[PDB]
Amino acid sequence: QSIDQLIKARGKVYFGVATDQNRLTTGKNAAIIKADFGMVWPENSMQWDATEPSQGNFNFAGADYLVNWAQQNGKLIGAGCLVWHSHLPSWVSSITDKNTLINVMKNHITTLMTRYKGKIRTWDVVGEAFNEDGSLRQNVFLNVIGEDYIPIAFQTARAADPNAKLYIMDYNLDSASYPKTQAIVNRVKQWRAAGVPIDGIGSQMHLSAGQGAGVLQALPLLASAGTPEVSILMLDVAGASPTDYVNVVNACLNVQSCVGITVFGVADPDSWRASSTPLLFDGNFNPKPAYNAIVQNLQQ
Ligand SMILES: O=[N+]([O-])c1ccc2nn[nH]c2c1
């Protein structure tokens, strides 16, 4: 039973998964994505270090493959991250002139979004912009440009492809009483009041066992920023307990602006934390108990 079909029947847009070329040609990933998921995201192939490893010299072979495959198989596409300290090649971090870095950032955003204009439902524009205490993270963009880099990034993205939904994403937004969760709400409200085109907040959700219950309170709090959409991104759950996964799905169903959920890969052995067996399919590509629990929850 397809969890994407079932979540669409409950009024949501998609159940998605991260993947890339060499996943689609190995294992049983392509068969499972075709049958059970409605949206694909490039795991790595759209990140800055993969797409612009030297200034102005773009690498699109891997991203092109994924976009083509998705179109051929009737899947939605999400993409990112346009601006994210974690995947930044060294040539960018060494820039010290404000105008140069603004131009570099704009060129990166505009080139990627133009190439796929009209084909991408959701773009993650800015990622991991916050410290755990809710202050802004001191990456090269904040240090050189200042806090205006976030408004500039979103304004540039909206002009490059007005059809795309534009998101800011971060992790550790999973507790309603954690400072980072209220801080991104505070800032996003302020930015949208200033006309910044932030369409969504994406929660990069890497949970430990038992943390699913708190998302029932955290996700409505993220929705109080007033963005048109919120999403769950890069989802995995240590231990893959049905209770944790069902709580995450119900948080999505409870929040009217939450459009869908993307899990961070298909099968456990291909996870960044495989020893925590945190995904919905096991190392033989069999659905795990959490997968069947989601199915039953969505049919209930
Ligand atoms: O939802 N995702 O799995 C996912 C993976 C990589 C990304 N880069 N930017 N946004 C992303 C979302």
Residue numbers in the entry: 4 to 303
Per the authors:
Over an evolutionary trajectory that yielded the HG3.3b, HG3.7, and HG3.14 intermediates, a total of 17 mutations were introduced into HG3 to produce HG3.17, resulting in a catalytic efficiency increase of approximately three orders of magnitude. To evaluate changes to the HG3 conformational ensemble along its evolutionary trajectory, we solved room-temperature (277 K) X-ray crystal structures of all HG-series Kemp eliminases, both in the presence and absence of bound 6NT.
In this pose, the acidic N–H bond of 6NT that mimics the cleavable C–H bond of the substrate is located within hydrogen-bonding distance to the carboxylate oxygen of Asp127 (2.5–2.6 Å distance between heavy atoms), while the basic nitrogen atom corresponding to the phenolic oxygen of the transition state forms an H-bond with either a water molecule (HG3), the Nε atom of His50 (HG3.3b), or the side-chain amide nitrogen of Gln50 (HG3.7, HG3.14, HG3.17). In addition to being held in place by these polar interactions, 6NT is sandwiched between the hydrophobic side chains of Trp44 and Met237, which are part of a mostly hydrophobic binding pocket that also includes the side chains of Ala21, Met/Cys84, Met172, Leu236, Thr265, and Phe/Met267, as well as the backbone of Gly83 and Pro45. From HG3.7 to HG3.17, no further changes in catalytic residues occurred during evolution. However, rigidity continues to increase at this position between HG3.7 and HG3.17, even though the side-chain rotamer of Gln50 in the presence of bound 6NT remains the same.
